[PDB]
Design a protein around this ligand. Structure first.
Ligand SMILES: *[C@@H]1O[C@H](CO[C@@H]2O[C@@H](C)[C@@H](O)[C@@H](O)[C@@H]2O)[C@@H](O[C@@H]2O[C@H](CO)[C@@H](O[C@@H]3O[C@H](CO)[C@@H](O)[C@H](O)[C@@H]3O)[C@H](O)[C@H]2NC(C)=O)[C@H](O)[C@H]1NC(C)=O
Ligand SMILES: CC(=O)N[C@@H](CC(=O)O)C(=O)N[C@@H](Cc1ccccc1)P(=O)(O)C[C@@H](C)C(=O)N[C@@H](C)C(N)=O
Ligand SMILES: *[C@@H]1O[C@H](CO)[C@@H](O[C@@H]2O[C@H](CO)[C@@H](O)[C@H](O)[C@H]2NC(C)=O)[C@H](O)[C@H]1NC(C)=O
Ligand SMILES: *[C@@H]1O[C@H](CO[C@@H]2O[C@@H](C)[C@@H](O)[C@@H](O)[C@@H]2O)[C@@H](O)[C@H](O)[C@H]1NC(C)=O
Ligand SMILES: [Cl-]
Ligand SMILES: [Zn+2]
Length: 607
């Protein structure tokens, strides 16, 4: 570690701790910058040389974390918990937590190598037909979205899960052991306990379960309605009206968003088509247009435009040359107050327009808290960061807003159109909830040891069936590692943030709509051009993590806790309508035939 990045001396009291924290944050910026820069260089250009460079950067970050962490423990370990300043307790409390820097050098290198190899495997995995091979994005993504052939969807689904999952399993087992070893030295029972601690709620898991109980009936009714719609097209052989839905038929590789099957489930087709994708294609929208349109919404609220450095630095399409990249969308803060970038393999699609807003929400957060000390440059909690762009996309997707940006003919304000819209939104928001909840339940079980390598897939599919009411379309066994075929698993990034964000975004939307002076139904609100809504949002963004999330939320929303009521209020009309329809159709809610799996196609797997 460079002499300039090593800690000096400070007194072993609160006053010295304040000076320690100030000096720590000054040095940390340079270390963060080199770390991010090397990660950017690899993720936008996957090579062996770029991977080695990223691994060296990770080692340097560990050296830094070790030096300052040991210093913090030397001076403050027995006293930091009694410090009067709560912001100071949070920062020193973080610095005393070494993580992977707790590992001996050999194991540090092993840990970094594993992360690199898992990332490489996930992003370079392909499905081969003789010589031509399909990638996840765009090839397999397009197939799951637009193919309605049971056999083709199966080939894509099985191909991907096999190609990504199988080689990942041995690496994931080793990562889990090393990660646990690291965090146990910091006093956590396991890595899952550390991840959960970010929410600073002693009742976090029970709070989540209470939230889910209120939401589950909405999912069960959506599920039943959708299952019936699928049965009408795939037939009694491939769809069991009392069983789980085959996992490959919902428009998405992980069945986590069902928006792609909207045309099959739309109750009133004679009304204007709310899926704006075909209109975007006809008009000739490109990635550039999508990002500029997203930017203009942010500026309409008097938030910050994207800086020159963003436009010059970002990767907004999958590169046309012979470059392999990480295609999963991401937003990047370089911690230099100047460089902020998005890397997205943008496709011309309505849901991708929502994803553009999502990523720009992360950037906007970075732009707003860039002048804070580096440790405060995060969301109030991870759920906040994930909610920002989604809140704005709720306004963008309204038929009225779509009309304003030229993507829809003036829509009527009638009950049929409302049901169509809310159903579309339910496919995107309600359908996701069970998946958002289950992923880290699986992962927490793995970190805790409740789920050993011998039950990885057994426990994955237990949760997928329990929550989502889906089943694998082909037989799986413990050689398969289907959890690993989801980006966030091999990329070691937590998932509960997304469940939190999907609830939180409706709380934000309600608060911002009220501030904007809007007086109608919540699902018809559009905050576009509301400088008052803008100012309220900006206060949250400029706060960073300087204050407990409960207090930030109280100031914005009037409540100091996550609450499902705004989501329920938003969806109320379609919730009632789906209940009524399922009752009339004589549906069974749930999947009592839990053991049911669909048969294989006759000519499996050829075609
Ligand atoms: C779509 O239409 C709804 C409903 O419109 C109402 O019902 C129809 C069947 C017709 O009778 C319409 O003539 C009638 O307006 C609209 O929602 C309604 O918006 C109005 C105006 O924003 C709301 O009135 C306000 O109510 C608050 C208290 O809640 C008062 O403080 C205000 O002074 C003001 O009177 C009204 O509450 C609301 N109605 C319902 C049932 O929610 C909606 O505006 C419209 N949407 C679009 C995009 O055009
Ligand atoms: C970790 C980081 O540098 N930026 C985060 C945003 C932030 O916390 O500042 C990010 O880009 N995070 C992205 C996911 C990611 C996480 C870690 C590495 C690479 C990608 P995202 O949440 O914006 C991508 C988003 C499309 C996503 O994954 N959504 C969920 C619902 C999903 N499964 O599709
Ligand atoms: C992808 O990364 C490689 C390095 O892994 C880059 O190749 C280097 O390019 C610079 C300048 O063009 C040369 O000085 C090096 O000799 C190259 N290294 C190797 C190992 O070939 C490459 O430029 C990157 N690709 C893109 C499009 O940025
Ligand atoms: C796990 O399953 C692997 C491949 O899947 C199997 O083969 C196909 C063609 C079908 O018959 C399907 O029903 C089977 O699941 C096997 O190669 C492998 O032996 C299995 N792993 C273990 C440990 O038994
Ligand atoms: Cl999280
Ligand atoms: Zn995100």
């Amino acid at each position: 570690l460079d002499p300039g990045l090593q800690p000096g001396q400070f007194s072993a009291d609160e006053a010295g701790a304040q000076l320690f924290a100030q000096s720590y944050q000054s040095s940390a910026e340079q270390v963060l910058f080199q770390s991010v820069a090397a990660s950017w260089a690899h993720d936008t250009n996957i090579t062996a040389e770029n991977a080695r460079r990223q691994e060296e950067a990770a080692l340097l970050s560990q050296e830094f974390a070790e030096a300052w962490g040991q210093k913090a423990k030397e001076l403050y370990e027995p006293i930091w918990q009694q410090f009067t300043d709560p912001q100071l307790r949070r920062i020193i409390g973080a610095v005393r937590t070494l993580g992977s820097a707790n590992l001996p050098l050999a194991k540090r290198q092993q840990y970094n190598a594993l992360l690199s190899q898992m990332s490489r495997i996930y992003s370079t995995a392909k499905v081969c037909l003789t010589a031509t091979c399909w990638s996840l994005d765009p090839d397999l993504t397009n197939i799951l979205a637009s193919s309605r052939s049971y056999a083709m969807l199966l080939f894509a689904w099985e191909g991907w899960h096999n190609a990504a999952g199988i080689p990942l399993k041995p690496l994931y087992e080793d990562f889990t052991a090393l990660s646990n070893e690291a965090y146990k030295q910091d006093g956590f029972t396991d890595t899952g306990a550390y991840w959960r601690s970010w929410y600073n709620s002693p009742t976090f898991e029970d709070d989540l379960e209470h939230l889910y109980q209120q939401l589950e009936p909405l999912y069960l009714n959506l599920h039943a309605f959708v299952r019936r719609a699928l049965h009408r097209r795939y037939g009694d052989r491939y769809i069991n009206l009392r069983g789980p839905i085959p996992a490959h038929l919902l428009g998405d590789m992980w069945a986590q968003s069902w928006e792609n099957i909207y045309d099959m489930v739309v109750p009133f087709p004679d009304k204007p088509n709310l899926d704006v994708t075909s209109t975007m294609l006809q008009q000739g929208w490109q990635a550039t247009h999508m990002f500029r349109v997203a930017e203009e919404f942010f500026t309409s609220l008097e938030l910050s435009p994207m800086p020159p450095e963003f436009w010059e630095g970002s990767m907004l399409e999958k590169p046309a040359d012979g470059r392999e990249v990480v295609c999963h969308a991401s937003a990047w803060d370089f911690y230099n107050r100047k460089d902020f970038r998005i890397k997205q393999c943008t496709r011309v699609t309505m849901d991708q327009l929502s994803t553009v807003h999502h990523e720009m929400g992360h950037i906007q957060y970075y732009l707003q808290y860039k002048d804070l000390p580096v440790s405060l440059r995060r969301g109030a909690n991870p759920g906040f960061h994930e909610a920002i762009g989604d809140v704005l996309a709720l306004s963008v997707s309204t038929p009225e807003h779509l009309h304003k940006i030229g993507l829809l003919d003036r829509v009527t304000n009638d009950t049929e159109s409302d049901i169509n819209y809310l159903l579309k939104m339910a496919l995107e928001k309600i359908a996701f909830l069970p998946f958002g909840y289950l992923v880290d339940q699986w992962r927490w079980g793995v970190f805790s040891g409740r789920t050993p390598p011998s039950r990885y897939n057994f426990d994955w599919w237990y949760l997928r069936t329990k929550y989502q009411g889906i089943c694998p379309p082909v037989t799986r066994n413990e050689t398969h590692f289907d959890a690993g075929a989801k980006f966030h698993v091999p990329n070691v990034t937590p998932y509960i943030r997304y469940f939190v964000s999907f609830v939180l975004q409706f709380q934000f939307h309600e608060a911002l709509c009220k501030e904007a002076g809007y007086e109608g139904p919540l699902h018809q609100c559009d905050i576009y051009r509301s400088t008052k809504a803008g100012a309220k949002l900006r206060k949250v963004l400029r706060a960073g993590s300087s204050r407990p999330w409960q207090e930030v939320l109280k100031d914005m929303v009037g409540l100091d806790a996550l609450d499902a009521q705004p989501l329920l209020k938003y969806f109320q009309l379609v919730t009632q309508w789906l209940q009524e329809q399922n009752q009339q159709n004589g549906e069974v809610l749930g999947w009592p035939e839990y053991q049911w799996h669909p048969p294989l196609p006759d000519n499996y797997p050829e075609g």
